[PDB]
Design a protein around this ligand. Structure first.
Ligand SMILES: Nc1ncnc2c1ncn2[C@@H]1O[C@H](CSCC[C@H](N)C(=O)O)[C@@H](O)[C@H]1O
Ligand SMILES: Nc1ncnc2c1ncn2[C@@H]1O[C@H](CSCC[C@H](N)C(=O)O)[C@@H](O)[C@H]1O
Ligand SMILES: [Cl-]
Lengths: 447, 447
């Protein structure tokens, strides 16, 4: 072992930073977050130090490095640009047996500052001894995406409950299985976050009363339009903790690979399937006691037929929640370079399908952006009947197929070519109509 | 944070353990592995301690607690069963400003010993500070399953190439891009694992020979409506690697916790557009990774349709990460789907601050979403009524959607004026029959 990691309790302990630049500012902010009583010594200070001082959060000593400021210090940080000054700081702290960090020379120091994931009281720290800062940040970013930030509140509720858990589950296996359920229960985490005490004690005793086997809930998760990177953090966390994932073909293969592999997969899609038995699959599995995730393309509440499922769940007592996704309009907008609103261009955006009878006097009006979902089929009926209501023959139209994926194709023309453009593409495609289409020239970044 | 993690260099520094039992043994084993000059002072020793003193790896001091043995120490550990003795030790350590650990007492000591995952020279440390030891074990065991066995060899080799990387690459960014490609080359990993030197050398020379890009870029990232879990995975990648992050009023404080600690932050808030652009323009022209962080989605009422031409006119590469828009975030979190089987089959996103076409907005069977229409709410009510919307149409106002401070008021269209006086910005107005579904779909809390 090259370094001993220790977690230091710093509240009202004296600490010294030498330096007054932005490096020293980052260090000072960490130590203030830790509750340190902080003195800063520097020849000059960036103004963020004088505001912290005015608000009585630190102490400033303008001048050269004064070894006697270390006199009652627990930690020293040399954060200047002068290796000479840092070495004098480092040497003065060594003789007083004060742990000292040198920002630019981590080998010169008696301690190193690692990358930190703060879910306090829960804390994770990563370092490789200075050999690889970029590896630490790479690991920090993956850790950040996996640990929900309300985990800390769940942590402290746990500690206040270990007497009840131990007095109810005899074996340690029984206890670990309970804790494993406790720490991934999301109505619990949301209730502690939102400070709803009725829902905490409700969820608390529902956790104690149901069998250790059971953990029935259903989560409606938006997978977004295609790109695995457009999943939400909450979404990725939910499909990692799931026992069964129910998915359609509108969920891209890359999203599916993010499903941790001991989960059961249920495909409920096209081949070459009514929503009614989909409701009963979800119903069945939740009442067997499984964490069911329903993955849907895009956003669940935008042409998802996703509300119809949940009111069946609400009438059986099955807890549920919903994680929104990037809808196709927003993804294709961004990946094709067509903003949906802009300036003098479009006051409003309209999301519509292609069922029943629509109102095309309404759809034809100007100063709009029109986005057609599932419109490819009735597409010819759309060109002739927007022009037949006075909308200009020169209005740019665009079709985005497979938006946000590496197979994205965009065809753009003018309203009077709308049918011709149409089956140069296939489903799934969006039809976008309006002046905003004309700014793809200046705004397309996706190669 | 409640603790401050640090990685101490203990080689040739005196440490003192008080206690000579199995708990003292496990802490002694750790300090020995970190190179400490160890002294153990106890009435009695388990046999492993005498086996260590015979090899000259520690000094044993038999007898009761001697305070003077602290004099030259950098760390102290109270590991007796006697809690009176442990307190005399932590007292004697306090006065000397020596970080001290008390085994049966996490809240009583100035440092905590964390769980360690070791991939030397890489190291991950996990602690919940004694509030939840079992969360720390479950997490440590999950981390153990995500860190590849042979990651330590990749880190070690990185340590040996730093001198060469810094000599051959002038700028910080060029070094970062080298390391970014180094740490995700699968083949270099397996070659290091198999001690295949010629294969390591061939990939290494080729990696050093690659042309490295020298451009800064501006990334527009959607933060989503507030909840930090609603950021996309890509958006998190961006704000964890960014050099500077330009952000607004409407980026919640929990998203900012995701911004990399070493990044610079610039706030905007009446700061008009032409100063933002030239801030963006001048920062990227210096080769820095620039993230523009905006609330919701950048291309929906984002004003971000002209930021991008100024950059395209300048030769600055740019990209766009879509975000969850306030409509689909507030929809999911108030229990109000934007579309539904027989309630609404089109969604209209409208602004507030010729003018609006009210005959079209008042049309049947659509959901209306008003962005920043709080100050204009009495007009919206008047106009929709005059163009034929029924007086009893359900309306809802979502304030601070997806945040811990979310508030929803709701009612009928003849109440829309009065309702707006009960909330403040930022807030959405949802108009349509879907609003009535909240009483069957609200899985979120009570405001
Ligand atoms: N990746 C994609 N690219 C282009 N259009 C897409 C798309 N994904 C979905 N669509 C559109 O959405 C239709 C399915 S309706 C499902 C909508 C989804 N819940 C959402 O919010 O996006 C398809 O017929 C197609 O018109
Ligand atoms: N968390 C939230 N809850 C309710 N309304 C919100 C909100 N965040 C933004 N808004 C609305 O959005 C307006 C800002 S316009 C920018 C919104 C962003 N581009 C998006 O896609 O959502 C505010 O006036 C408010 O009406
Ligand atoms: Cl490192």
């Amino acid at each position: 072992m090259d370094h001993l990691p220790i977690f230091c309790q710093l509240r009202d302990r004296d600490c010294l930073i030498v330096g007054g630049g932005d490096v020293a500012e980052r260090k000072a902010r960490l130590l203030l977050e830790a509750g340190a009583r902080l003195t800063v010594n520097a020849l000059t200070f960036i103004p963020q130090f004088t505001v912290w001082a005015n608000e009585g959060m630190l102490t400033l000593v303008e001048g050269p490095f004064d070894e006697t400021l270390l006199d009652s210090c627990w930690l020293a940080i040399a954060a200047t640009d002068d290796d000479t000054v840092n070495q004098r700081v480092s040497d003065a702290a060594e003789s007083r047996r004060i742990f000292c960090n040198v920002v630019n020379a981590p080998k010169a120091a008696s301690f190193i500052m690692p990358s930190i994931i703060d879910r306090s009281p829960l804390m994770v720290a990563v370092s490789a001894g200075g050999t690889s800062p970029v590896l630490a940040r790479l690991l920090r970013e993956k850790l950040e995406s996996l640990l929900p930030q309300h985990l800390g509140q769940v942590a402290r509720y746990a500690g206040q409950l270990r007497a009840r858990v131990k007095k109810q589950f005899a074996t340690m296996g029984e206890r670990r299985r309970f804790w494993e359920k406790f720490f991934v229960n999301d109505r619990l985490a949301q209730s502690l976050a939102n400070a709803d005490e009725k829902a905490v004690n409700a969820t608390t005793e529902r956790l104690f009363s149901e069998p250790l086997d059971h953990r029935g809930e259903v989560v409606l998760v938006g997978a977004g339009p295609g790109d695995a990177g457009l999943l939400t953090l909450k979404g990725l966390q939910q499909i990692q903790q799931a026992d069964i994932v129910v998915y359609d073909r509108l969920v891209s293969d890359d999203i599916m690979n993010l499903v941790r592999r001991d989960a059961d997969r249920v495909f409920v899609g096209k081949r070459a399937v009514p929503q009614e038995e989909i409701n009963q699959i979800l119903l069945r599995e939740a009442q067997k006691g499984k964490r069911v995730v329903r993955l849907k393309g895009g956003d669940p509440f935008i042409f998802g037929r996703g509300g119809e499922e949940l009111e069946t769940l609400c009438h059986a007592g099955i807890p549920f929640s919903v994680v929104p996704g990037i809808t196709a309009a927003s993804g294709c907008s961004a990946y094709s370079g067509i903003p949906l609103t802009h300036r003098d261009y479009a006051q409003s955006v309209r999301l519509v399908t292609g069922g029943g009878e629509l109102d095309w006097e309404n759809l034809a009006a100007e100063k709009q952006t029109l986005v057609f979902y599932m419109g490819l089929n009735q597409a010819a009926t759309i060109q002739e009947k927007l022009i037949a209501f006075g909308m200009q023959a020169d209005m740019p139209v665009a079709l985005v197929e497979n938006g946000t994926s590496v197979k994205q194709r965009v065809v753009h023309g003018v309203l009077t070519q709308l049918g011709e453009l149409a089956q140069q593409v296939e489903s799934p495609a969006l039809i976008i109509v309006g002046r905003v289409v004309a700014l793809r020239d200046k705004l397309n970044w996706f190669s």
